[PDB]
Amino acid sequence: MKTITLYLDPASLPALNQLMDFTQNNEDKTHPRIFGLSRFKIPDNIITQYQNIHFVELKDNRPTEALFTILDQYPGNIELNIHLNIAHSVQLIRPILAYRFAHLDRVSIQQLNLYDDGSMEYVDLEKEENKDISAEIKQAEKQLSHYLLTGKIKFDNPTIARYVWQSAFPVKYHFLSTDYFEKAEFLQPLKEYLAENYQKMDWTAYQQLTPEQQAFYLTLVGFNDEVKQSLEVQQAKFIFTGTTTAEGNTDVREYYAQQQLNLLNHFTQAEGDLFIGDHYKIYFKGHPRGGEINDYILNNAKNITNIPANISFEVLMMTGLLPDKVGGVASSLYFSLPKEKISHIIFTSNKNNPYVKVMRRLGIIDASQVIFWDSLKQL
Numbered sequence: 550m551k552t553i554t555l556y557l558d559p560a561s562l563p564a565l566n567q568l569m570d571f572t573q574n575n576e577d578k579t580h581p582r583i584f585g586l587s588r589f590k591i592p593d594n595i596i597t598q599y600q601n602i603h604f605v606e607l608k609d610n611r612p613t614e615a616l617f618t619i620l621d622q623y624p625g626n627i628e629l630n631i632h633l634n635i636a637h638s639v640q641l642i643r644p645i646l647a648y649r650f651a652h653l654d655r656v657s658i659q660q661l662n663l664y665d666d667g668s669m670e671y672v673d674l675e676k677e678e679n680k681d682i683s684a685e686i687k688q689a690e691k692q693l694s695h696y697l698l699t700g701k702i703k704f705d706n707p708t709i710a711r712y713v714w715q716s717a718f719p720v721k722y723h724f725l726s727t728d729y730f731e732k733a734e735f736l737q738p739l740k741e742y743l744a745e746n747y748q749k750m751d752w753t754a755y756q757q758l759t760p761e762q763q764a765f766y767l768t769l770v771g772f773n774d775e776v777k778q779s780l781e782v783q784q785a786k787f788i789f790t791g792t793t794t795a796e797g798n799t800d801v802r803e804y805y806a807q808q809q810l811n812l813l814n815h816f817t818q819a820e821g822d823l824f825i826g827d828h829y830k831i832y833f834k835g836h837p838r839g840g841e842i843n844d845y846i847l848n849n850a851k852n853i854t855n856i857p858a859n860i861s862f863e864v865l866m867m868t869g870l871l872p873d874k875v876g877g878v879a880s881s882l883y884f885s886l887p888k889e890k891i892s893h894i895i896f897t898s899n900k901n902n903p904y905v906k907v908m909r910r911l912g913i914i915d916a917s918q919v920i921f922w923d924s925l926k927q928l
């Protein structure tokens with residue numbers, strides 16, 4: 550029959566990983582592909598090279614009904630190769646299962662490849678610390694069965710349910726942190742349950758690509774020559790990393806912008822609590838979804854080189870263009886950054902802190918008192 554590959558992610562990290570998958574399998578120009586990556590626009594010059602390449606919008610963390618129109622274009626027997634965001638897996642696959650129900654004779658799920666949204670999955674797991682994990686797993690598999698058979702969603706534990714897909718399909722999990730699963734003792738039952746169905750995100754994949762594929766990849770993630778050259782300068786560098794929010798909208802978005810600018814000053818100003826030194830060239834790597842928050846930094850800071858917000862930080866690691874130091878608000882990017890390059894990681898207020906616990910458990914931060922940006926004086 551025929552295999553159809555779907556790349557779905559409303560966030561950044563899973564999409565970054567999925568674009569690598571696309572690059573590795575980019576030779577086949579006719580393999581049907583459906584892209585549902587909210588934060589990525591595949592360049593037109595690349596699209597034209599492929600046939601049976603489709604695009605679908607995501608709304609409320611699930612592909613829209615426009616997905617059914619695409620699938621109807623393949624009348625034969627089709628096996629779905631689905632790539633998903635782990636945190637949002639249940640909703641992202643919802644429309645796919647609904648379609649399958651109506652075309653049970655020709656539509657089947659071939660396999661699932663799941664990738665971490667980022668720190669979110671770990672913060673969520675951290676909250677399950679006092680649960681009987683072994684029992685939570687059994688209940689989740691049961692409720693997953695109910696979802697697969699009735700199409701209805703009802704999970705007593707939405708978090709653990711994200712990890713019981715193997716009970717229904719061939720699966721492969723790609724974790725931002727395999728250490729968390731080994732260091733969090735309360736999760737031992739889960740680690741054992743997952744058996745050989747997981748691996749850590751492979752950040753060395755880019756280096757294994759051919760010279761042609763690496764350029765294909767760089768084009769997909771937006772890493773142009775101008776940015777590359779700005780990072781090839783000879784001088785110690787410091788990249789300030791931004792964050793974003795979705796809380797209280799406007800008011801909170803403006804609070805975030807102001808606290809982030811103040812944070813930057815604490816790193817770059819001689820009188821700052823986190824002053825890095827004067828020999829560093831300053832760069833700003835804003836959050837992909839920072840929006841007005843990123844603009845606030847550029848409009849109110851000086852002598853700072855902007856690295857387009859849409860360019861995922863990990864790309865610098867892949868290209869071997871990491872700076873000497875990195876500092877900013879807690880982010881998923883710090884999970885794969887070499888410890889020697891960490892300046893300071895600051896946490897946001899606006900409510901024990903689950904995120905703090907996760908990074909401490911992984912040794913990303915030490916036992917010392919954590920810095921929340923609401924405790925930094927206005928410079």
Ligand SMILES: Nc1ccn([C@@H]2O[C@H](COP(=O)(O)O)[C@@H](O)[C@H]2O)c(=O)n1
Nearest residue numbers: 561667790791834835836861862880881
């Ligand atoms: N300042 C930032 C913040 C996040 N990011 C990318 O977005 C992802 C998720 O980041 P957050 O955990 O900060 O939301 C990361 O894995 C990183 O790829 C970035 O490239 N630059």
